[PDB]
Amino acid sequence: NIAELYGKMGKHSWRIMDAIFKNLWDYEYVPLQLISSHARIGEEKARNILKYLSDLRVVQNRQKDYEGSTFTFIGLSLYSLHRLVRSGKVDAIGKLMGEGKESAVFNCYSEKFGECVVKFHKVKVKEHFSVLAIRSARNEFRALQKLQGLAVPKVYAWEGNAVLMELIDAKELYRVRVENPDEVLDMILEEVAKFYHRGIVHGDLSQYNVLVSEEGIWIIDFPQSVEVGEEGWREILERDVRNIITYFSRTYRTEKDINSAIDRILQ
Numbered sequence: 142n143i144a145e146l147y148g149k150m151g152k153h154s155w156r157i158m159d160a161i162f163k164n165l166w167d168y169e170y171v172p173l174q175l176i177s178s179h180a181r182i183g184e185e186k187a188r189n190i191l192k193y194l195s196d197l198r199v200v201q202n203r204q205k206d207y208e209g210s211t212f213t214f215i216g217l218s219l220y221s222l223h224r225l226v227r228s229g230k231v232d233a234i235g236k237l238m239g240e241g242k243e244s245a246v247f248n249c250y251s252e253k254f255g256e257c258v259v260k261f262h263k264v265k266v267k268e269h270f271s272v273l274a275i276r277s278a279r280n281e282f283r284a285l286q287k288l289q290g291l292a293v294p295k296v297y298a299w300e301g302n303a304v305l306m307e308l309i310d311a312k313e314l315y316r317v318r319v320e321n322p323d324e325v326l327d328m329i330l331e332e333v334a335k336f337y338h339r340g341i342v343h344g345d346l347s348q349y350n351v352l353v354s355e356e357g358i359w360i361i362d363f364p365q366s367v368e369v370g371e372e373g374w375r376e377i378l379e380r381d382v383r384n385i386i387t388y389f390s391r392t393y394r395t396e397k398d399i400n401s402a403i404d405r406i407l408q
């Protein structure tokens with residue numbers, strides 16, 4: 142369906158989407174007049190385009206205070222895919238691999254990079270969808286770049302809410318029973334130490350974000366990552382270590398002291 146949606150888009154549609162994208166920095170709902178002026182498409186025609194894009198679930202239009210438009214998740218993903226296609230990084234989008242509360246992950250093929258996944262991202266006052274989703278994608282991309290050569294996917298590109306990376310032929314740890322859990326846990330903790338040496342804390346280390354095969358382990362899912370030195374980095378690192386050791390304790394009864402494991406990494 143994402144491919145079908147893509148095929149409904151003409152040059153004028155992409156220009157309208159570009160105009161929203163380029164004005165997200167200072168509006169959630171970009172005013173019609175700005176979309177029109179940026180796209181160099183007359184207001185009545187721009188309005189007609191935005192109505193059709195809303196019909197296709199690509200934009201959400203509001204009128205409470207003024208006529209304004211923003212991306213839906215589908216629309217931001219579609220636009221980001223377009224940027225990837227136009228930069229020659231992706232040739233065809235393929236089948237959905239899976240979707241949940243934080244992302245939708247699709248298979249795709251790149252003549253340059255081979256079989257890939259593209260991951261579309263979904264998500265100081267504690268109580269701007271697009272701006273936050275783009276920030277999430279950019280963070281994952283930057284973390285993956287910094288960690289290249291370690292046990293993570295090769296990363297190829299980032300546009301909008303999309304990150305293009307290597308497909309890993311491995312399953313989530315959560316789904317795999319290992320017969321050497323103590324060694325597996327040690328390999329994970331060694332990778333945590335290597336990330337830390339590179340100034341990166343994962344931020345969501347879990348049984349759902351470690352992939353395993355007979356061949357080894359990979360770690361994925363970096364939008365929550367922080368740099369060492371950022372507020373709370375140490376407690377976030379401790380959490381990653383505590384959570385993965387706790388998983389192994391509950392599942393395998395491995396005996397690994399959390400305090401010593403943290404202290405070993407940190408020294």
Ligand SMILES: Nc1ncnc2c1ncn2[C@@H]1O[C@H](COP(=O)(O)OP(=O)(O)O)[C@@H](O)[C@H]1O
Binds near residue numbers: 241307
């Ligand atoms: N590079 C990849 N190779 C293979 N499978 C992947 C890759 N990236 C994501 N996946 C699959 O998609 C799921 C969701 O990806 P993930 O990065 O964990 O995002 P989320 O935050 O939505 O959990 C993963 O648990 C994994 O099964």
Ligand SMILES: [Mn+2]
Binds near residue numbers: 349350362
């Ligand atoms: Mn995950």
